């Protein structure tokens, strides 16, 4: 063995890397994270950190050969999709900046990034209202397709000079705990979503998979300390487990449009009526301005 | 971070695993090794260990979910291809048996396995005649293809119930040192061969790549202790670096047919003449029998 590792064993580059509010294992050959783990709470998702002051850039700790660069993504037909969201790190400028390191980024469909995936990230943030602590493992997937002749093929695009791997699917393992003193099994949900436009019709539960099925597909073992026979319980069994629909989501966007200059506030309300337009909290903001 | 890894970070399953005469890093999602490192010498490739007493079987140390089984390979149209060869472990029954663990095996083209790849393994064994110590890193690759429209796609087949990944290419990093007291840079050669029939016409040097180019494609850093600016020298610059041709190879097979019962030895010589048939060492064996 001393003869065998005389000049050292090859470097896989898959060791866990820690950041302020997220940890990850990088995939040196695909130039994408393999998994990204974060902890989120009521407090962490509140703060003055601003997404606008952040810039996407290679992770300084990754060898430049195995790193992706913005040139790989810009003009590819694919977006720079965060795995650990910027929006879960309002409490810390450092933490938010570190989620803009390309080591947390994956070539994600533009519509999925701002649509379905966004609503899943929003649902994870919502859970902090009902669970004191939420844990999330996010990451890419290159799943096979079975042709008519019975053959199973893994087919994915590589973008840029660096051949950044475009996944077919994205996963999220949501682990949620009520309080520190709770003795009830922790709520777990595993979801696999295709890297394409999805819309509002499909329910999040349509994309649910078993933890074992996700582990088999991804080659990973999530939250190894949890005893699968006593510590885990389906999140759907103990939570509404629903994303915001078209009406709830467009209302959420319009409420955020209520903050920014002029009497443009009349134009926002005219657009909502042109079928949604209600909500009580909405008015306690569409008055506190004018 | 204590909050973040409360239930542990996900398990990648990519840690180095040591065996008697080989080490490897497994790819839990593809069910194939990522790299396999071995040390070979004049002595190790000599012994009474017999390939016939060995059986292909899942590696006992791999979680069965991430392991491949013979059922995945048998009937797939692909062979069980050793990365660390059985033939490099004649000195040890244990060592040879451990190279039959599916953790060392890759779905390899039947012809490449017995043809070109076999001759590369033979060339590695030959180097022990000229270098006291030879180190070898072997492994699979899924490289992209550029379509006519400019798009780069990684396309590979998955075989069996377990979806064992069929590589497009196979690599070998050959590290060779003259003696323990030598101060000359070590001889290095990196080669990438497609997972298909190749034949005798292509020279091994047609498949040579730079170490840096292999590292970029594979996402690995080979022999990290070697200073690339002072310790390494192209193997082609200091070695014949040639595989056995059709005549040398068929003669080598016939010499091995000289060991096994009857006066079938006349039939072997008749087949050689039917254009090759010479060699001096050959006769010192085709007499020591009859
Ligand atoms: Cl983008
Ligand atoms: Cl969508
Ligand atoms: Cl076979
Ligand atoms: Cl061949
Ligand atoms: Mg996003
Ligand atoms: Mg072989
Ligand atoms: Na590009
Ligand atoms: Na099969």
Curated annotation (Swiss-Prot), chains A, B:
Its EC number is 3.1.30.-. It comes from Homo sapiens (Human). Keywords: Endonuclease, Hydrolase, Membrane, Metal-binding, Mitochondrion, Mitochondrion inner membrane, Nuclease, Transit peptide. The chain holds residues 59 to 351 of 368 of the full protein. Signal peptide: none annotated. Its cofactor is a divalent metal cation. This is Nuclease EXOG, mitochondrial. The active site contains 1 hydrated divalent metal cation that has only 1 direct interaction with the protein; all other interactions are via water molecules. Endo/exonuclease with nicking activity towards supercoiled DNA, a preference for single-stranded DNA and 5'-3' exonuclease activity. Changing residue 219 to V: Abolishes catalytic activity.
